[PDB]
């Protein structure tokens, strides 16, 4: 019943963060303090839409 829609692989292409987990943990506090606005916007969108396909941007 119905056909699922999935974004094309060109829509999932982005410059990945290629640092390991320890590097991320070292600067986790400053990253959370400085980069808070896009992270919070993304997480609110994720919790409200309940759909990974509506939060690519």
């Amino acid at each position: 019943p119905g056909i699922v829609e999935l974004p094309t692989l060109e829509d999932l292409k982005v410059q990945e963060v290629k640092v390991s987990s320890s590097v991320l943990k070292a600067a986790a506090h400053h990253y959370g303090a400085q980069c808070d606005k896009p992270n919070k916007e993304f997480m609110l969108c994720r919790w409200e839409e309940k759909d990974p396909r509506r939060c690519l941007e």
């Binding site: 994720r46 919790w47 839409e49 309940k50 759909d51 990974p52």
Partner: protein, 63 residues
């Protein structure tokens, strides 16, 4: 006593019994329909209450 007493007593009794018979037939039909469909107060089997659901963020966006 006179015949009118028995006459009218019989008439009242006949009315009462006829009404009771019609009511019994109506009750049987109503019960049959109510059990078949389930849209009346009778035969309302319980379902899960919806007040038990938790509506809160669940540590995972997709619930």
């Amino acid at each position: 006593d006179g015949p009118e007493k028995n006459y009218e007593k019989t008439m009242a009794i006949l009315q009462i019994e006829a009404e009771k018979a019609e009511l019994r037939l109506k009750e049987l039909e109503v019960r049959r329909l109510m059990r078949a469909r389930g849209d009346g107060p009778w035969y309302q089997y319980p379902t899960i209450d919806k007040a038990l659901i938790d509506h809160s963020p669940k540590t995972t966006p997709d619930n």
